[PDB]
Symmetry: C6
Subunit: 50 residues, 6 copies
């Protein structure tokens, strides 16, 4: 099952506030797994603003 | 029982921010089941903005 | 106990965004029970905007 | 322990959106206990807007 | 562990909406412990608006 | 596992509302561990506003 903040970091990618770097900071923080970051990046960045 | 982000992706369809493609990205990500996507699409898209 | 999205659909009725039809779509989706829809409709629709 | 929507209905009283009637509709709906409604009404109504 | 509404009442203190009186109403309501109120008051009131 | 308010205090750092002092108040309150504060500070402060 996913990290507690997966939905939070996925939302920030989809609303265009998060960057590639931020997600990696979260990976090294342990708030996301590497696999989760790669999954979030598979979404259209800033899709909510389209 | 539903995927953790079902209510999140249902809300984005109902508020008119999500698209058909986005839901399918979530299906292949494993954040939604195929059945859940098809269920969300059964709702009036952008119903909150009506 | 109630469906996960009961509080969500109750809020949308109370803030005047949801309709009678939408609640029934949710009933047939299985995101609300028939009894839950009938309960939500017992509230003043758009009570938050009054 | 409290009804799931206690914090929701307490917030609506504190932000000045809920009324005495609404809380009682929730009591008869079973979304709040009578004791919970009486507790919420013990707070300053619309305290967040003060 | 903390009362369900601890994070809610802490947020209202930090965003400058809650007062000393409100927190005490919550103490007597049983939505916060006395110790929790005293803890919340240890934060800079309206810190989010600074 | 993390303190209940970790995601809350991480969000306030990322949206630029929280300060170094605030996080330390939360450390001494016991709403965050020292390790959690140091982790939150490893993120770009006010990253959501960038």
């Amino acid at each position: 099952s996913e990290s507690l903040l997966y939905g939070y970091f996925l939302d920030s990618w989809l609303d265009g506030t998060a960057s590639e770097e931020l997600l990696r900071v979260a990976v090294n923080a342990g708030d996301l797994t590497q696999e989760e970051a790669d999954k979030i990046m598979s979404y259209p960045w800033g899709a909510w603003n389209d």
